[PDB]
């Protein structure tokens, strides 16, 4: 009956194992013009990217207002205890409760129109992350699911959360909007509908807490704002176009005046756009 749910029960192959062409490269290999839109947009991002900037900070005991200027997009990846409970690993850093996360003053650094991308896990964070969005002044507007395949080690995985009824095989990155933005008329700030709300990759090795790098591509494609903050990033996530702030960073190079200067005159805080991308991107 082509029932992949039954197939999982019988074999341990998760249903998502049978989705084809989920990689960054192979998805549009047969679609030259879909591929070209992505290639040109990635080139526009690269051409306009600030060099990587990063700051070691204990975010629990940090005045977040020290991060300037305001940010167009914020990616927030607090280390949840569930990441370590569900894998068995002992955390090497402070784990954050949702009370801890909610106390962050994200509204003090968000631009008046801006977006947030909050990694929420698979359990109570789907509910408490929404409360956090409210507290910070965002409206939940999409839910990007990271779906994990087990092609390399088929089998079952016990979810440790005693309230779970199903085996949990995904994580949710909630997207929030602040301010007024209209996809049809604010095309100098957002390119809507370039990516889908799904990321599909293989389960990471044990001990690896990293999130899929595709989340950066979705954010960068979607919002033309150049001021991008990654809170709780690490040495391994440092990336051009981003300011990375986190406790486990081994060095710091952030200078608030230098960083702000990249976006002030004669520069813009927006990437701009080419005529070629405007002709290719989805519009309604």
């Amino acid at each position: 009956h082509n029932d992949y749910c039954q197939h999982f029960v019988d074999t341990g192959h998760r249903p998502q194992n049978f989705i084809r062409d989920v990689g960054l490269a192979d998805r549009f290999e047969e679609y030259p013009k879909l591929r070209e839109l992505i290639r040109l947009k990635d080139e526009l991002i690269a051409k306009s990217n600030t060099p990587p900037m990063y700051l070691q900070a204990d975010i629990e005991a940090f005045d977040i207002r020290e991060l300037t200027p305001k940010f167009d997009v914020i990616l927030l990846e607090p280390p949840l205890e569930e990441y370590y409970r569900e894998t068995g690993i002992t955390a090497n850093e402070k784990c954050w409760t949702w009370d801890d996360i909610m106390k962050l003053e994200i509204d003090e650094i968000a631009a008046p129109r801006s977006f947030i991308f909050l990694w929420c896990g698979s359990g109570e964070g789907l509910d408490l992350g929404r409360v956090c969005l409210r507290k910070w002044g965002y409206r939940r507007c999409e839910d990007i699911c990271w779906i994990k395949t087990n092609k390399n080690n088929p089998g079952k995985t016990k979810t440790l959360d005693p309230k779970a009824v199903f085996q949990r095989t995904k994580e949710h990155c909630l997207m929030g909007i602040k301010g007024t933005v209209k996809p049809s008329t604010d095309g100098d700030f957002i390119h809507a509908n370039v990516d889908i709300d799904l990321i599909i990759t293989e389960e990471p090795e044990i001990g690896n807490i990293e999130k899929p790098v595709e989340i950066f591509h979705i954010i960068e494609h979607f919002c033309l704002g150049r001021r991008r903050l990654h809170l709780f990033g690490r040495d391994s996530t440092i990336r051009p176009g981003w300011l990375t702030v986190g406790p486990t960073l081994t060095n710091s190079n952030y200078n608030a005046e230098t960083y702000a200067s990249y976006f002030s005159a004669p520069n813009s805080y927006l990437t701009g756009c080419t005529e070629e991308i405007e002709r290719l991107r989805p519009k309604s």
Partner: protein, 204 residues
């Protein structure tokens, strides 16, 4: 018990005649604040549905989209449930690929539908962890949600009586009673339910 169903308006049927169920499932026509080619129920109509009568201990499966991601959570709480899982249906085309193009969401494109899983009371006789929380299936005919959910629910709660609200004729299943305004008349087999039905609705 073979399939049973009642063609009815969910807002107005006295569902106390139906007894208790181990699983409730609903795929409601939420008012998602946009023009739709079908009629919807208001938020207040959804809030007031008499879900609490249908269960003392068991599970609720509530499909949600759009602003109903939040309204559905409110309804779960208003009806007495705690949310303990969230299933997503990943929609694939005929060749097992996600359709990535078009404008299928307001900000990002949409590759999935969500179903909230709620628990009430202290159910027993259920099987945790047999299925994953990701369904992969093509969109079939008029289907708004995938038929794979019935098998997941049966493996979770085998042999128990279950009720579906806003169900369609395609959705009638053994062990389920299906309620909805497009079903073909009234067809009840459980002797305890037929007795309460004609007590409550003597003229039929």
């Amino acid at each position: 018990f073979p399939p049973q169903w009642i063609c009815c308006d969910i807002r107005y049927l006295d569902v106390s005649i139906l007894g208790k169920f181990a699983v409730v499932m609903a795929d409601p026509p939420w008012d998602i604040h946009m023009e739709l080619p079908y009629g919807t129920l208001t938020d207040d109509e959804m809030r007031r549905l008499n879900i609490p009568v249908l269960q003392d201990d068991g599970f609720l499966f509530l499909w949600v989209t759009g602003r109903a991601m939040e309204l559905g959570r409110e309804c779960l709480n208003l009806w007495g449930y705690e949310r303990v899982d969230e299933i997503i249906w990943v929609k694939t085309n005929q060749l097992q690929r996600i359709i990535r193009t078009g404008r299928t969401g307001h900000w990002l494109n949409h590759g999935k539908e969500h179903c909230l899983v709620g628990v009430k009371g202290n159910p027993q006789g259920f099987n945790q962890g047999l299925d994953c929380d990701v369904i992969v299936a093509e969109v079939r005919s008029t289907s708004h949600k995938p038929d794979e959910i019935y098998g997941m629910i049966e493996r979770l709660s085998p042999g128990t009586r279950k009720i579906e609200l806003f169900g369609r004729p395609h959705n009638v299943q053994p062990n389920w009673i299906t309620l909805g305004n497009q079903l073909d008349g009234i067809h009840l087999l459980d002797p305890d339910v037929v007795a309460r039905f004609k007590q409550r609705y003597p003229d039929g």
